[PDB]
Subunit: 419 residues, 4 copies
């Protein structure tokens, strides 16, 4: 069987490793998002279209380099390349725009960061990767600089030094997610300890149900060479096996000679690594560690993920306004793809931060009766699923909806047979 | 502590001290035993059904009303004794006592009627007396048949044939009473609705010191198959003459419930003993204590690992509903069911939450007592013009009855299990509702 | 051979879950191992004759309980003499001799706060007559155990004190009582009157689990085979109660009226023996050993470190037995706490230790009577050979079996530190 | 007692966790490694690492096995490299605290059958007393039988580590492992023969199967590749070394990093530093439980004693397991259970001392004293030699507990005793 299913049925982690097979082909869609840094090698609209097709989900703008005019042109080219595929709504792929700050240098929040954060809000960025976060008040300062119009922007705190690692719990508590920024971390702490910080932060983010990004030098040699080293493919695979929600490309896409090939390589590795995850242990541990809850979205999410594993569901289709119901399903790491149907273009972009969430932006005319409108969004999730290869006739899907309009009311799970 | 800290702040430390919840959160079975507490009071309604044999000591309508109030769920008629006229009178008295509570539909308790056959004796097949007794059962509308000395699958096919076309709905519980029945258990279970571990004859047919092995094996296999299993005979034997049982008898009842039995039975204790009502009360009190002492964490994990993957939406919905109920400490799972099957599939996962089964079928309401933790509510209202409105009314009946009976309080979370179209076999929906 | 793997519930033993272990239990899978749960029989008019006592020792009685709630000191001194005469009648065959402990069960405190004056006199009688164990009635707190220990005086330091938990206070103060006691008795008779009868199983399971965690003996007592006081065969609930006490983890099971005053004393001992043997094979060792290991704290005591290594080695090779040399019984007790499937054959020169180790599940005491060899290593080896020859005569061992041998580096108690894998020749 | 400081080091809070997820959450960059580095480092000897002075620095940095790649150079060139390795190793014989055996491994050029060049290179290996052969492109069991036959009448004690470098070797892995002494995951060729994105699956599978079989497994190629020209490795390279150790590799290897790069000693130091951190991060609670469950029951006393000794070592946090071995087999059977305690192997065989570097956590001590007339006295002198070397090296202190593994009679194959000793 395909997708490492013989290894998935093993009774121990050791026997699971023994049953991994190079001939067992991945079938599921790639779950881990790829963040590509936009720079001179990846700015053109033509190049960006190839990167979107290769698998890029989030475009990162590094505000340590370039100018506001330079980054505004990069953003416009990304949006032009993304919108060139809007003519086919059943296959359109949203792409998030993330702003990576310069940081505080030797100083609180720098004056350049205040200006760059204002630029981000004015240009409608979806995410901020806040550099050198060392305490909870650093996150509050970034949040205040985003102003009242930036309330919806996700703040991903970059842990880059000893203090950020030691104050991790307080930083995670007030952040939307974390970035393990291994470049600076490997200079701030002994290089041989970075893997411990990475594994600990990934484990704690998985426990909290918050996104974690593994970043820097994942495919470094691909800046000048067409193929990566054996250590680089292993590093990407191990970040996915560790539990990372996203993987990142920096120089490989910003300035390298093979930007599209680097995206394709991360895509190919992530797909193979996701099938090699030992879900039997992972799901059991995530389920046991997740606290008891009286929030109906939290209760519906665990019931839906348990139902999906019971029937080998091809997908969990969820309606979401903010992305929260999809995120609560994602935290249990289902093998079934989480297809998130939303009308919010921003939520569709932001939900790429959560592993295994495939956003579908709903642009069909509204139905007069709310129950009919919900049913047509579910049929849209199914038709997009069929066109993209997620679903076939005869598959079982789990459908997650709410009892009334508006965010916060998810409380229903349904088992549906396709066609 | 982090996995229960926010819910402990919300529900309070008193909530988490009751119903053996500190033992329930233990990481190993050994730690679970160490945390069992005689001061941790049971809160949940008693989920293991009590089968009481009706005889001279428990035949009067007034006595039967006391037995229904004490906890009797199934009335057993032993066709090894008495006559058809005698058993017909016992059935009529049971129905009169049961119907005396029908005036309040929100609190009415259905009681099943089970016929226990005499058996084949030295003969190889279905005896002539069994054919007549089975015909009597169909004519008197019995809900269940406890078939004596089942030794192979063809014995149950013979009982099924003798029930005729009008007895298709009657549940057949095969009694395993000898070495052959134990050895051919898998084939017998496959064609039966459930099993009875008939320890009286089993303890004479096989060495007495081996009966506990047969009991534990059959209970484990029935739990794995999701089929009811009854533990029977000499559970509270000394209560035939004494008002209080021995230490071995209370332990035996508690251990049958901990083994996984769906029902426990009283024979001479209710049929001829001096303390029939007290015997029912004692089984009720022990079963409530033992149900709270079940280590659900291991049981649910093992039922998931052992159960094969399923593409039946009723089965997929049932595991999702039970998982959701454990996540929020749901007070109940309300399920709409025509035949009892959706309630049975929830029951096989052994939820701690009560399974309140709302049905229009009076027979299904009586028969679901065979499944652990299923509380039947008989809905008597005529159908609404719009099917979705009729579904909603039945769910509200379950909620309002749940509040009236003490199962539910304002602020509780309940899991609601329904289907997408009318008729049996279409359960596919799970909803989380907050009680207001 | 394939026959080996069909016996002693070995298909159920290899199951991956407790549920599948239950599903694989087989009434045709015969027990092979020797019965490991000790039987305590209460002495009375039905079991006091020397000839009847010989039959009870052959049926499996390991501990004789003297109930000091009945009879004078003169009655109990005769009971002691008769027990010793019956036990010593088998001393002429040292390879088959079975030690039998004598336990004194006190009358209790009554309406008083703690140690009654009658208990002080009974305890002094126990020391003067050399009893091995005291079952202290109605223990409610740690100071009750200290009072029993003080009443035993300086000459009774070696006597084991088993605290009987018989009321709500003893259950609530269980941890402090267990800490100062050598073991516990779940006295279900009084417990079932002091607390609601439907809660006794919770107290029994909790106390057995905590004693197993602590590595201290626990006795399940009262009305286990009650109907056998007058009837030749027990009820279905009684056989199930005995089997479930063994499956719960009890080290000993007890008979009271069944052996003291009933008409079937020998048959009651035989019935407990037959049930315990079937129940011990049905224990799911895979989960039990895993949980005992995880719960047991780290240790720097070499006896404890050797014991866990020896039990792990025994499971790896399906050892027929673990033979241990012991002066006080402590090395055998530390092996027993890990619940090996292999029998723990304890070879000792101490007649008292040989009697007292019956409190520990799976310990088979052998009393070595030969004078010491001049070379200490030769004395150790002769004792190990005595364990092997006793084991072969009694059916524990055959040629070709593997056995784990546990010894120490110097004479005297407290120095066990060696484990060795030995092939039986 | 041990103190609270003891329980804060070597990731002991993460070691006590009840789940793998909790274990990851408790990993701490401030919890310092204390145990000696247990994963062996294989360094390829070439132009950048051939001189006696350079080899002395590589031995001090942590090199345990010297690899000679017969795909390059000549017999004369490799004979000079072997002589320089032996000269550098023997320069530390004057101090027990610095002397360390170093194995010599011959890596063949590769292949219808065994090539003429491989036959001659294998003969060169036997004549020069190599300890190990890394056999290139092993595709089936008969390839290993051909290498074994070419090792001739004198080289039957040489360990054959089969290099799995293509699709066929991966598919016929079980039959190859059965007849080999160990495996090398040769990722360079493997990443060209199969899709590059599948190499991690083959690596994890082969490591898991070798751990299950109790046979050494080497992770090789491009582990610290950028260190050929740069003084510090990339983030992906440090992670790759740490993950090979966490996967269960017995050895890690350096190729161009030591053979031709500008920083050979620094590459060895980097592998040493990462392996030490990664070994403390292994979740022993699950690993030991799974190795125990997957391993079949055994009636071999060495195997039964090994599991009892490893269980005893975990129970008391033993500083070391001292084992007397002539062939290395008793040390290998302890190593397969992955104890946290160091396995100090006392042997009179210089070849067994070099070869046990293939087994994770085995620290060989070569013993050269003349045999005592009373065998029990000869055994006691070797046990005390292991203890005094352990005290001198920092493994042991007075008051520590050690597990000692011996047999009941002389000769290899009789290990059946485990003892708990308090260090005095
Ligand atoms: O302290 C510093 O000076 C910088 C520091 N380190 C680095 O950025 C690394 C070293 C430099 C190269 N990069 S890179 O290749 O990933 C990279 C390069 C570029 C851009 C990036 O975003 C980017 O990540 C631009 O955006 C851009 C824009 C306009 C012109 C050129 C460029 C460009 O070359 C890695 C940091 O980010 O804090
Ligand atoms: O498929 C092949 O072509 C054969 C294959 N080679 C490679 O692919 C490797 C990758 C490129 C570089 N390395 S290297 O830097 O590690 C390497 C280089 C050299 C030596 C090595 O051992 C060695 O591994 C010498 O021993 C030596 C001796 C004398 C002169 C020069 C040298 C020398 O340069 C070799 C193999 O050896 O398996
Ligand atoms: O994931 P979120 O943000 O809570 O959104 C979930 C919400 O989406 C719905 O399914 C559909 O709501 P809308 O019709 O307003 O889009 C609600 O019933 C539910 O509360
Ligand atoms: O448990 P059963 O027998 O399958 O009945 C479940 C059925 O009950 C319902 O919830 C309601 O059906 P009715 O309206 O026919 O009573 C169905 O949607 C579902 O299929
Ligand atoms: O179990 P205990 O009382 O600690 O006795 C174990 C002792 O028995 C021995 O094996 C034999 O000692 P003796 O020769 O004194 O009987 C000692 O080596 C060991 O210390
Ligand atoms: O690991 P190996 O090669 O089997 O060697 C273990 C052998 O070493 C010993 O401990 C000591 O043997 P020698 O005195 O011959 O060295 C033997 O008793 C045991 O059989
Ligand atoms: O800023 C970053 O991404 C880093 O340092 O790794
Ligand atoms: O028939 C019965 O119920 C029995 O034998 O137990
Ligand atoms: O004293 C006892 O043995 C009792 O009360 O059970
Ligand atoms: O030969 C090797 O070492 C390789 O291919 O990795
Ligand atoms: K930046
Ligand atoms: K009958
Ligand atoms: K008494
Ligand atoms: K080579
Ligand atoms: Mg940085
Ligand atoms: Mg019968
Ligand atoms: Mg009493
Ligand atoms: Mg190669």
């Amino acid at each position: 069987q395909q997708q490492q299913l013989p290894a998935a049925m093993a009774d121990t982690f050791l026997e699971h490793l023994c049953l991994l097979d190079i001939d067992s082909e991945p079938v599921a869609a790639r779950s881990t998002s790829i963040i590509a840094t936009i720079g001179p090698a990846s700015r053109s609209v033509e190049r960006l279209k190839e990167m979107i097709k290769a698998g890029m989900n989030i475009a990162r703008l590094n505000f340590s380099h370039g100018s506001h005019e330079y980054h505004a042109e990069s953003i416009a080219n990304v949006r032009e390349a993304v919108e060139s595929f809007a003519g086919s709504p059943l296959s359109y792929r949203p792409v998030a725009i993330a702003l990576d700050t310069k940081g505080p240098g030797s100083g609180g929040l720098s004056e350049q960061d205040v200006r760059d954060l204002r630029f981000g809000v004015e240009h409608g960025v979806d995410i901020v990767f806040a550099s050198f976060v060392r305490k909870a008040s650093d996150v509050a300062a970034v949040r205040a600089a985003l102003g009242p119009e930036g309330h919806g922007i996700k703040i991903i705190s970059k842990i880059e030094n000893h203090e950020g690692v030691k104050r991790f719990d307080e930083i995670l508590e007030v952040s939307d997610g974390i970035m393990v920024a291994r470049g600076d971390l490997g200079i701030e702490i002994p290089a041989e300890k970075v893997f411990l910080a990475q594994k600990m932060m990934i484990g704690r983010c998985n426990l909290a149900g918050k996104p974690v990004v593994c970043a820097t030098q994942m495919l470094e040699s691909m800046i000048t060479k067409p193929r990566p080293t054996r250590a680089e493919t292993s590093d990407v695979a191990n970040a996915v096996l560790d539990g990372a929600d996203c993987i990142m490309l920096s120089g490989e896409t910003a300035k390298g000679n093979f930007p599209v090939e680097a995206v394709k390589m991360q895509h190919a590795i992530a797909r193979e690594a996701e099938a090699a995850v030992y879900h039997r242990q992972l799901f059991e541990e995530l389920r046991r560690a997740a606290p008891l809850s009286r929030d109906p979205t939290e209760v519906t999410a665990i019931g839906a993920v348990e139902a999906a594993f019971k029937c080998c569901a091809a997908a969990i289709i969820v309606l979401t306004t903010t992305g929260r119901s999809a995120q609560l399903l994602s935290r249990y790491r289902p093998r079934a793809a989480v297809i998130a149907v939303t009308r919010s273009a921003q939520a569709a972009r932001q939900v790429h931060l959560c592993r295994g969430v495939f956003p579908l932006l709903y642009r069909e005319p509204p139905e007069a009766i709310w129950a009919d409108d919900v049913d047509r969004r579910v049929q849209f999730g199914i038709e997009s699923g069929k066109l993209r290869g997620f679903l076939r006739v005869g598959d079982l899907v789990i459908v997650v909806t709410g009892w009334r309009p508006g965010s916060g009311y998810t409380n229903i799970m349904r088992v549906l047979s396709i066609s």
